[PDB]
Amino acid sequence: MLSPADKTNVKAAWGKVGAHAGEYGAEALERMFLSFPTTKTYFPHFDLSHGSAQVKGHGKKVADALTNAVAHVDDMPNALSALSDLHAHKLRVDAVNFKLLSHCLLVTLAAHLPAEFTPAVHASLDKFLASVSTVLTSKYR
Amino acid sequence: MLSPADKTNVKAAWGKVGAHAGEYGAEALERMFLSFPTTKTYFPHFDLSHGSAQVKGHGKKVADALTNAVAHVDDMPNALSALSDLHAHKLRVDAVNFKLLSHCLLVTLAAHLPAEFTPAVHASLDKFLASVSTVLTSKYR
Amino acid sequence: VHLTPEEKSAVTALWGKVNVDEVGGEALGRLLVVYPWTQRFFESFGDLSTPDAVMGNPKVKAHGKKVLGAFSDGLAHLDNLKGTFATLSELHCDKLHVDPENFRLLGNVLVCVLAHHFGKEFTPPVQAAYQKVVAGVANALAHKYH
Amino acid sequence: VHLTPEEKSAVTALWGKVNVDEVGGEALGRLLVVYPWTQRFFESFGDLSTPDAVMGNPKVKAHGKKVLGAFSDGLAHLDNLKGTFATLSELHCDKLHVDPENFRLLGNVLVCVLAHHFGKEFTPPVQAAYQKVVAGVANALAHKYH
Ligand code: HEM
Numbered sequence: 352m353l354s355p356a357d358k359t360n361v362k363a364a365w366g367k368v369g370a371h372a373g374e375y376g377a378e379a380l381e382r383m384f385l386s387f388p389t390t391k392t393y394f395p396h397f398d399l400s401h402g403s404a405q406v407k408g409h410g411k412k413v414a415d416a417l418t419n420a421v422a423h424v425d426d427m428p429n430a431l432s433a434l435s436d437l438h439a440h441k442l443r444v445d446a447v448n449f450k451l452l453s454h455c456l457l458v459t460l461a462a463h464l465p466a467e468f469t470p471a472v473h474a475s476l477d478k479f480l481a482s483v484s485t486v487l488t489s490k491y492r
Numbered sequence: 493m494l495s496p497a498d499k500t501n502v503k504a505a506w507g508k509v510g511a512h513a514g515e516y517g518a519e520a521l522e523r524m525f526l527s528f529p530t531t532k533t534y535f536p537h538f539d540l541s542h543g544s545a546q547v548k549g550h551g552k553k554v555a556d557a558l559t560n561a562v563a564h565v566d567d568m569p570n571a572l573s574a575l576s577d578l579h580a581h582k583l584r585v586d587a588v589n590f591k592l593l594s595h596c597l598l599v600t601l602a603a604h605l606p607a608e609f610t611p612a613v614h615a616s617l618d619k620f621l622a623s624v625s626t627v628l629t630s631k632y633r
Numbered sequence: 634v635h636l637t638p639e640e641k642s643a644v645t646a647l648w649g650k651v652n653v654d655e656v657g658g659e660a661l662g663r664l665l666v667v668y669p670w671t672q673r674f675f676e677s678f679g680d681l682s683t684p685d686a687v688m689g690n691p692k693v694k695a696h697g698k699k700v701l702g703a704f705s706d707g708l709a710h711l712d713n714l715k716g717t718f719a720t721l722s723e724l725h726c727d728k729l730h731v732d733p734e735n736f737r738l739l740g741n742v743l744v745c746v747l748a749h750h751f752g753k754e755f756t757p758p759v760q761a762a763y764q765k766v767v768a769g770v771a772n773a774l775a776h777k778y779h
Numbered sequence: 780v781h782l783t784p785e786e787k788s789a790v791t792a793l794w795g796k797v798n799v800d801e802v803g804g805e806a807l808g809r810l811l812v813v814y815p816w817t818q819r820f821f822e823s824f825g826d827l828s829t830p831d832a833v834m835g836n837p838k839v840k841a842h843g844k845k846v847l848g849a850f851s852d853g854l855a856h857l858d859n860l861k862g863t864f865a866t867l868s869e870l871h872c873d874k875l876h877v878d879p880e881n882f883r884l885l886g887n888v889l890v891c892v893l894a895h896h897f898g899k900e901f902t903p904p905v906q907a908a909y910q911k912v913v914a915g916v917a918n919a920l921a922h923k924y925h
C-alpha cells in the first residue's frame with residue numbers, strides 16, 4: 352500500500368521522465384534481456400538485437416502503461432484491468448519475471464535521474480512497481 | 493482472490509485436519525527446517541531437535557492461526573491483523589520464507605489426507621496459503 | 634547436488650516403488666491445474682477447461698509419462714545431471730521456449746505427488762533429499778539457456 | 780564466476796573507479812530504507828527511523844565500508860568466490876543468523892547504486908556482468924549454511 356508520500360515521490364520522479372519514458376521503457380527491456388536471459392523465452396517472435404524496432408516499440412507500450420498507472424495511482428486495479436486480463440489469460444508470463452523487469456526499470460531510472468533517485472524515492476518507486484506487479488498478476492488464478 | 497469453490501474446498505480439507513492441526517503444524521515446521529535450512533536463522537533460540545517441545549509448541553500456534561483464518565475466510569485481513577503487525581514489526585521474516593512454509597504445509601496435508609487431497613483441493617489450498625502469506629506480509633513497508 | 638550417500642539411498646529406495654506412468658500423468662496434470670498459466674505450452678492438447686478435463690486428458694497423461702521417463706533416467710546419473718540433460722536443456726530453450734521457472738513448479742508439484750502417494754513413508758528427511766534432487770534437475774534443465 | 784574475459788574486464792575496470800567508502804555506506808543505507816525488515820540485524824546502530832536518519836548513521840556508513848571492503852577483495856578471486864568467502868559464510872550462518880536472501884537484496888541495491896553513480900558508463904552489458912557477480916557473491920556467502 353502506497354502512502355501519500357510514495358504517491359507523491361512517484362509522480363515527481365515520473366514527472367521528470369517525461370518525453371523519455373519510451374526510451375527508458377526500451378532500455379529497461381534491453382537490460383532485462385541481457386541480465387536475465389530466461390526472460391527472452393516470452394519474446395521468441397521479436398528481434399532482440401540492440402535497437403530493434405520491436406523492442407523500441409514495446410518499450411513505448413510499457414512506458415505508456417506505467418504513465419497511465421501513475422496517473423491512476425489511486426485506482427490502479429481499475430486503470431489496468433485490461434492489462435491484468437491480457438497477462439492472466441493470454442500472455443501468461445510467470446509471476447517471477449515481474450520482479451526482473453521492475454529491477455531493470457529502477458536501474459534505468461537510477462542511471463538517468465541521479466539527482467532525483469534519492470533513497471526515499473528509490474523506496475517509493477520499488478513499492479510502486481511491486482503494486483503494479485501485483486495488479487498485473489492478480490487474475491492469474 | 494478465493495472463489496466460493498475455493499472456500500468450500502478449504503473448509504472441507506481443513507475440516508478433516510480437525511484435532512490434528514497442531515501435530516500437522518509441527519510436522520510442517522520440521523519438513524521446512526530439513527529441506528530449507530536457511531529458515532532456521534529465524535529460530536536461533538529454539539531447540540530444533542527431533543521432537544522439540546519448542547517446535548511442538550510453535551506448530552500449535554501456527555495451526556491455531558490457520559484454523560482462525562479458515563473460520564474467518566471472508567475477513568482474513570481483519571482476523572489476522574495482529575499477526576500481520578507482529579511479523580511486519582518485530583519478527584521481520586523475509587517475504588520469501590512464507591512460500592517455503594506454505595509448500596511444507598501442502599506436503600504435510602498431502603501426506604495425511606490422501607482422499608481429500610484432490611487436484612482441485614490442492615489448487616484451492618495453494619491459493620489459500622498464498623492469501624494468508626499476502627496478509628502476513630502486507631504491512632512490511 | 635549435495636546428496637549424502639544415505640540421501641541417495643533413500644531417493645533410490647522410494648523411486649523403486651513409483652509407477653512412472655501414473656505419477657507422470659498426476660504431476661503434469663496437477664501442474665496445469667494449480668498453476669493454470671503453465672497451460673500456455675499445451676494449446677494443441679485440447680480441453681484443459683476443468684480439473685477433470687486436465688487430469689483425464691489422454692495427451693496430458695502421455696506427455697506426463699514422457700517427462701517422468703526422462704526424469705527417471707536423470708535419477709541414474711545423479712552424478713552428471715548437466716550432462717544427462719544437455720540436449721533437453723537446449724531443446725526447451727531454443728525450440729520450446731519454456732521459462733525455466735516451470736521446471737521448479739513441476740519439481741514442487743512432484744514432491745506433493747510423492748507425499749500424496751507414499752503418506753508417512755515420505756518422511757521429513759526423505760523430502761529433503763527429493764528437494765535437493767528436483768532442484769538439481771531444474772538447474773540441469775536450465776543450464777543451456779542463453 | 781562464469782565471466783567472459785570481456786565481462787571480467789568490464790567489472791574490473793568500473794570497479795577501479797569506485798570509492799568504496801561512499802558506495803558501501805550508500806548500498807547499506809539504501810538496503811535499510813527500501814527493505815525496512817533488514818533493520819532487524821542493526822538495532823544497536825541507533826536511529827533508523829528515517830531515510831535521513833539511516834543515511835546519516837555513521838555506524839551504518841562504517842558497516843557499509845566493511846561490507847564493500849570484503850566484497851571488493853572478492854573480485855580478486857572471481858575464480859573461487861567459494862573458497863574466498865567460506866569463513867564469512869560460516870560466520871553469517873552460525874554467528875549472525877543472517878538469512879542469505881539478504882545477500883541477494885544487497886546485490887540488487889548495489890547494482891542500483893552503481894547505476895546511480897556511473898550513469899552512462901553503466902551500460903546494459905556492464906550491468907549483466909555485475910549481475911553475474913552479485914549472484915556469484917550471494918551464492919558463495921550462502922554456501923556454508925546448514
Ligand atoms: C512492469 C510490468 C509490465 C507492464 C506495465 C507491461 C505492459 C505491457 C503492455 C502495455 C503490453 C502491450 C499490450 C498491447 O499490445 O496492447 C504488454 C505486452 C506484453 N508483455 Fe507485459 N508488461 C509488464 C511486464 C511483463 C513482463 C515481466 C513480461 C515478460 C518477461 C511481459 C511480457 C509481455 C509480452 C510477451 C507481451 C506481448 C508483446 C508482443 O507480442 O507484442 N510483460 N505488456
Ligand code: HEM
Pocket residue numbers: 531534535550553554555557558575578579583585589590591593624625628
Ligand atoms: C502463513 C504462515 C505463518 C503463520 C500462520 C505464522 C504464525 C505465527 C504465530 C501464530 C506465531 C506466534 C506469535 C505469538 O507468540 O502469539 C508466530 C511466531 C513466529 N513466526 Fe510466524 N507464521 C507464519 C510464517 C512464518 C515464517 C515463514 C517464518 C520464518 C521462516 C516465521 C517465523 C516466526 C518466528 C521466528 C516467530 C516467533 C516464535 C517465538 O520466538 O516463539 N513465521 N508465527
Ligand code: HEM
Pocket residue numbers: 671674675699700701703704721724725729731735736739770774
Ligand atoms: C522434469 C522436467 C522435465 C523433463 C525431464 C522434460 C522432458 C521432456 C521430453 C523428454 C520431451 C519430449 C522431447 C521431444 O519432443 O523431442 C518434452 C517436451 C516438452 N516439454 Fe518438457 N520436460 C520437463 C518439464 C517441462 C515443463 C515443466 C514444461 C512446461 C510447463 C515442459 C514443456 C514441454 C513441451 C511444451 C514439450 C513439447 C510437447 C509436444 O510434443 O508438443 N516440460 N519434455
Ligand code: HEM
Pocket residue numbers: 817820821845846847849850867871875877881882885916920
Ligand atoms: C555482500 C555481502 C556481504 C558481505 C561481503 C559481508 C561481509 C561482512 C563482514 C566482512 C563483516 C565483519 C564482521 C566480523 O568480521 O566480525 C560483516 C558483519 C556483519 N554482517 Fe555481513 N556481509 C554481507 C552482507 C550482509 C547483509 C546483507 C547483512 C544484513 C542485512 C549482513 C549483516 C551483518 C551483520 C549483522 C554483521 C555483524 C556486524 C557487527 O558485528 O556489528 N551482512 N559482514
